[PDB]
A paper describes a structure:
Sodium and aspartate symporter [name] is an archaeal homolog of human glutamate transporters, which clear the neurotransmitter glutamate from the synaptic cleft following rounds of neurotransmission. Briefly, the transporters are homotrimers with each protomer consisting of a centrally located scaffold or trimerization domain and a peripheral transport domain that harbors the L-aspartate (L-asp) and three sodium (Na+) ions binding sites. The crucial conformational transition from the outward-facing state (OFS), in which L-asp binding site is near the extracellular solution, into the inward-facing state (IFS), from which the substrate is released into the cytoplasm, involves a rigid-body ‘elevator-like’ movement of the transport domain by ca 15 Å across the lipid membrane. Here, we report a series of Cryo-EM structures of [name] reconstituted into nanodiscs in the IFS and OFS.
We then determined the structures of the GltPhIFS complexes with the blockers TFB-[name] and [name] under saturating conditions in the presence of 10 mM inhibitors. Surprisingly, HP2 does not open in the same way in GltPhIFS-[name]. Instead, the hairpin remains mostly closed, but its N-terminal arm separates from the C-terminal arm. The bound [name] assumes a similar rotomer as TFB-[name], though N401 still coordinates the backbone carboxylate. The C-terminal arm coordinates the sidechain carboxylate of the aspartate moiety as in GltPhIFS-Asp. The [name] benzyl group inserts in between the two arms packing against M311 and M362 sidechains. The N-terminal arm movement disrupts the Na2 binding site, consistent with previous observations that binding of [name] and TBA to the IFS of the transporter required only two Na+ ions. The movement creates a small opening into the cytoplasmic milieu between the tips of HP1 and HP2. Perhaps, it recapitulates a transient transporter state, in which a Na+ ion has already left the Na2 site while the substrate and two other Na+ ions are still bound. Thus, it is likely that the release of Na2 requires little structural change, limited at most to the change observed in the GltPhIFS-[name] structure.
Author numbering:
A (entry chain A), B (entry chain C), C (entry chain B): 2 to 417
Write the structure that this text describes.
Amino acid sequence: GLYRKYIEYPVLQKILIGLILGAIVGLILGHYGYAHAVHTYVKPFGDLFVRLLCMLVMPIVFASLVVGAASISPARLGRVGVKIVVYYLLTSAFAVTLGIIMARLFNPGAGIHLAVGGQQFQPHQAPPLVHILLDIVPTNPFGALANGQVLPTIFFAIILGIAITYLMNSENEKVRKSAETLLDAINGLAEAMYKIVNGVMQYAPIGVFALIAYVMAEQGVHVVGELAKVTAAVYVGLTLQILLVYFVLLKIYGIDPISFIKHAKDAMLTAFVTRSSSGTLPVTMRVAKEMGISEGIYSFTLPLGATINMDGTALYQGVATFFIANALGSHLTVGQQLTIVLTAVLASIGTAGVPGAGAIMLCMVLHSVGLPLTDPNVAAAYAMILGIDAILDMGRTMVNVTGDLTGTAIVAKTEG
Amino acid sequence: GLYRKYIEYPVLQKILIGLILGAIVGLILGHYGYAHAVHTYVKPFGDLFVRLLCMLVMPIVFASLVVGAASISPARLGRVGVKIVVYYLLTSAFAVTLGIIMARLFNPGAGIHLAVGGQQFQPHQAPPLVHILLDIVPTNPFGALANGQVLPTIFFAIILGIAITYLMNSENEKVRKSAETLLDAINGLAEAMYKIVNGVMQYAPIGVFALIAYVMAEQGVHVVGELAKVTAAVYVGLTLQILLVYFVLLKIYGIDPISFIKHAKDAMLTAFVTRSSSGTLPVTMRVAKEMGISEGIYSFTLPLGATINMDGTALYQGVATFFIANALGSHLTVGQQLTIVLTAVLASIGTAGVPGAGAIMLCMVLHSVGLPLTDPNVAAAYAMILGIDAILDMGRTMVNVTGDLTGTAIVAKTEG
Amino acid sequence: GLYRKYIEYPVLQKILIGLILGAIVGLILGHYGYAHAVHTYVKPFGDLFVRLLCMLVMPIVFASLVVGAASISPARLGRVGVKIVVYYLLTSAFAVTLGIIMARLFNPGAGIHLAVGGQQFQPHQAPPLVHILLDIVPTNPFGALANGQVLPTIFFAIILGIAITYLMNSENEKVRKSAETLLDAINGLAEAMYKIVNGVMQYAPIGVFALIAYVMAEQGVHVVGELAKVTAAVYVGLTLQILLVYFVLLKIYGIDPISFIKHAKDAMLTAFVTRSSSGTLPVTMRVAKEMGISEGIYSFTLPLGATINMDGTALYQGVATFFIANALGSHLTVGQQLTIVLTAVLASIGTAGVPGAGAIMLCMVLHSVGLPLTDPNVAAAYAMILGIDAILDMGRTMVNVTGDLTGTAIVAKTEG
Ligand SMILES: N[C@H](C(=O)O)[C@H](OCc1ccccc1)C(=O)O
Ligand SMILES: N[C@H](C(=O)O)[C@H](OCc1ccccc1)C(=O)O
Ligand SMILES: N[C@H](C(=O)O)[C@H](OCc1ccccc1)C(=O)O
C-alpha cells in the first residue's frame, strides 16, 4: 500500500524531506552540467504545483471575502465586535508595514538576476493615482472576475457580503431565505476550495522537490544564502512583531506579558507544529479559558480571530513581495507599497486557516502590484519563494494564533 | 453625529440640494475660468458614482431577468395571467414607441457637440440584420456574461427562468428541491444588488453635485436649456401616455376615467413623493380595494405590476437614448430603434421598483445600441442625463404605478 | 391549434420528416441553380439551431461533471462501486478506440472539400506534449469557463465535485449544509440545461430541414453517399462493439449471451424507439429483475449506468470527430486522438440521458481538438453531421442501455 503509506505520513516532515532532497539533487546535477536535462525532465512537476495554486487563487478570493465580509459587517456588530475588528485591521496594517521595514533593512534576493528569457522584466508604467483609485471599483463584476483583477473582485465581494447581511435582517421571509441560500452556497464554494488546497498541499512535496531541484541546478549555491536571508528577515520581523506590538499593547492595557506568554505556550506550540489556525481553535479556547477571560468575550473573538486576524501572514506578504521585486531588478514605488498594504489587509478578512494558503495570498498580492504570474521571471521568483514555504508557515502561524489571544485579552480588560 | 445626520435626512431633498448647489458652483467656477481645477478636483466623485452604477448594471440584468421570467413563465399562468401579461408587454412597447415619438418631436440635446477628446464619436458600421438576429443568441453564456453583451444575457436569463419553472413541476423530488435552491440563490443575488443600489443612491447627492458642477463649468449655461427640453419632453410624453393610452383603453373597456383618477390619487401621490413601486404596493392595494375590484384579481396583478409593468421608465428610455445620441452628433438608424424597443421591454420584466434604477436600465439600453459607457463621449452625455435623474424619477414612477391600477381594472371588468 | 398539434406530435418522426423534406427541397433547388436564394433565405434557421446547441455546450459541461464527479467520487464507494466504475471507464475508452478504428477502416467524408470561404482550414501548430499536459490544469477557473476551454473546465469540475463529496462527510454541520446547498444548486443548473436541450430538440426539425436543404443545395448529391458511409461506419462499429466487447466479456465471466440478449429485448427496443437512457430506466430495472440479479447490486448500478456509461455515444464521438476532420482536408495526429479518447471518456461522466445531447458532446470533443465551431468550415461539417443525428441516436442509445445490463450482470456474477 504505497498510496496509503504516502497519505498517512505527515505533511510537514514530507515537505521538509522533499526540500532537502531537492536541494541535494539540484546541486549535484548542477555540478555535472546536467541543468537542461533536470530542467526538461523535472521542472514540469513544479510547474504543475504552481498552476494548481494559481487555479485556486481566484475562487478563494471571491467566496472567502463574501463570507468574511458577511462575518465582519456593521449590520450585526456590538461594541465588542467593532472594538476588536478595528484592532485586528489596525494590527494587520502595522504588521505588513513592519514587513516592508524588515524587507528594507535586510536585502532579500539582491545580487541574483532572473532574466530567464534573456531580457529583464521591465515594469509597465503606472497610471495616475486617481485612475487606480477609480479602477478599484469594477466596470463589470463578472468581467473583473473573469481575468485576474484581484482588487475589483475584493471590492465587489466585500460589498456583496455587506449587502447579504443587510438583506438577512428584513421583515420579509422570501428575501431572507433567498439571502441565506446564496450565502450558504458561497460558503460551500469557499470550503470546497479549502478542501482542494488541502489536497494540493498533500501533493506539494513533489512540487517543492522539483522547484528546488531546478532552482539549485540553474542558479547554483548562490541562491541558498538569499533564501536564508529571507528566512532570517521573516523570523526577525515576526519576533519583533510579537515583542514590540503585543508586549507594548499589553503593557499599555495593563496585562503582564510574561505570564501571558507562559499561559499561551500550548496555543503557540500546536500552531507551530500543526501549521493551521482553524485546527488550533480548541487549544486557543482552552488557553483563553485558563487566563481569566469572560465567557461571552472569548467565545466570540477566537473564531473571528482565526479568520480575520492573520498578523504573521501579512508580514510574510511584506517580505515576500519585496523579495520577488528585488530578485527581478525592478523596485516597488511609493504608491505600489500601499497597494501591498491594502491587498494584504483586505485579503485576510475571510480566509479560514488551512496549511499552505499564504502561497495563494502571495499570488493575490502579486497580481495587484504589477508582478503577474504569467511573465516568466515572476514564475521563477515565486518558485524560489514557494520552495521554502514550509519552513516559514510554522513561523507565520504561531504569531497568527498569538495575536488572537492578545486581542482577546485586550478587549477583555477594557469592559468588565 | 454627522453621519447619522446625513443618512437619516431624506434622499430626494438631498439630491435636489446637491443638484442646485452643483449647478450654482459649476456656473460660478465656469465664469472665473476655473474649469480645469474644478475638473481635476471635483469630477472624480461623479466618475465614482458612474462607475458604481456601471458595476451594478450586469448582475441586476442576469438575476432580475431570471426571477422575472420565473414570475411570468407560461408553465404557471391562468387566463388572468396571460390576459394581463400581454397587456403589460403591449403597453410597454407602445410606451417606448411614444418615447421615440416625443424625442423626435422635440430636439433633446441638439446644438451641443460633446467632442471631449477632440474627436467626435463615430458609430461603428452595423452588421447585417440576420447577423444581429443570430447574435441575440449567445455562443457562451458565461462569455456573454463576462464582457458586456446585454441582449445575450437577457435571452439566456429568460430561457433559464422558464426552464426553472418547468423544472419545479416535475414528479421527482431531488430536481424540485434543486430548482428551488437555484431560484432562491439567484433571487438572493437580485435582492442583494437592490440593497447595493439603495446604498449607491444614498451616496448619489455628492455624485450628482460633482457631475452637474463639471457639466455647468465645461459646457456652460447653454446646457440647462437642453436639460429643460429633456424634462419637458419626458413630462409631456408621460402626460400624453396617461391621457391617450389609459383614458382611451378605459373608455373602450367601459370604465369612467375621471372617477378612476380621483380614486387613484393616493397611489399616484405617494409614488410621486416616494419614488418607488415596491414601496407603494400597500397603497396601490388599498386603492384597488376602494374601487370595486375582486379579491383574487387585484391580489395577483399588483405585485406582478410592480415588477413587470414599468410604463414610464420605458418612455424615459425612449427619450434618453435619443438625447444621448443627439448630444454626440450621430443619429440612430431604423433597426437600431427596434433594439431600443426590445431592450426596453425585456429589461423591465423582473426589476422590482427601487429608487434610481432607471439610470441602470439606461446603461442596459445604451450597451446594446452601440453607445457604450467606455468611450469618453457617452460617459459625458450619460453624466448630463444622470444629473437630472431625481426630477425625472418622480414623474416616471407615478405613471408606473398608474398603469398597474389601469391594467387591474381592465382585467377586472372583462371576466366577472 | 397548430402549436398544440406541433408539440403533441412525436419528436423522432418529426425530425425524420424534416430530414427527408430537407433533402428533397435541397436537391430540387440545387438542380435549378437556386443555391444562393435557398442559402440566404433558409440557412439562418439551421444556424440558429447550431447556435442554440453551442449555447448549451458549456453549462452542461460544468454542472454535469460536478454532479457526476459527485456521483463517482472515491469518498463514498464500496467494492461494487469501484468494481463497476473501472469497468465503465475502461469500456468507454475501448469503445472510443473502436470508433477511431472504424473511422479509419472506412473513409467518412473523403472526396468532399469544404473550403466555403475560398481557403482550406489550416490547423494551428501543436504545442509540445508537456505544454498541453500542463494546460489541462487551468490558471483561472472562471477564465477557462469564460472562453471555451473544455478540458480545463472538465478538470476543475471533477476536482470540485470530489471536494464537495469529501466536504459532505465532516463532523461540522454548517459546512455540511453549505456543501449540500452548493451541490443542489449546481444540480438544479444541470437539470435546467437538460430542460433547455429538450426544448431545443423540440425545435430541431426546422433546423435539420434548413441544414440538410442548404447542404444538398450547395454540395449536391455527392454528400448523401458520404453520409451513408458515416451511418454504415457507426452502425457496424456499434454492432461489432456489442458482439466483441459484450459477448467476449460475458463468455469470460461465464454468462450465456444468447439468453441475455433474449431477456434484454425490451430494454434495447424501448431505447431504440425512445432515444433516451433516463427514460428507459424502469424498463432496464425490469429487465435486470427478470434475469437473476440481486436487489442491492442492480438497484445501484443502473441509475449509475444511465449517467456514466455512454458506450455508443463515445463510438459516435470517435467516428464523427474523424468525419469532420476528413471533410476539411486536414488529419488528426497521434497525440490529438488521445485528446479525443480523454474528452470522450470524461465528458460522459455526469450527463443524464436526454435525446439529442450527443450533438453537444460533439462540440465538447471538437472544441478540445483544434476544430472549433467559430471557423466557417467546421460549422459546415458539423451541420452535415448534425443533419443525420436522429438516424444515429436510435443506434447509439440501444448499446448505451445494453452496456448497463452487461456491466450489472458481470458485477453480479463475481460476488455472490
Ligand atoms: N498559516 C496561516 C494560518 O493558517 O493561519 C496562513 O493562513 C492562511 C491565509 C491567511 C491569509 C490569507 C489567505 C490565507 C497560512 O497557512 O498560509
Ligand atoms: N421609478 C421606477 C420604479 O421604481 O418603478 C423605476 O423602476 C426601476 C426599474 C425599472 C425598469 C428597469 C430597471 C429598473 C426607477 O426607479 O428607476
Ligand atoms: N442517446 C444517448 C443517451 O441518451 O444515453 C446520448 O446520451 C447523451 C449524452 C451522452 C454523453 C455525453 C453527453 C450527452 C444522447 O442522447 O445523445
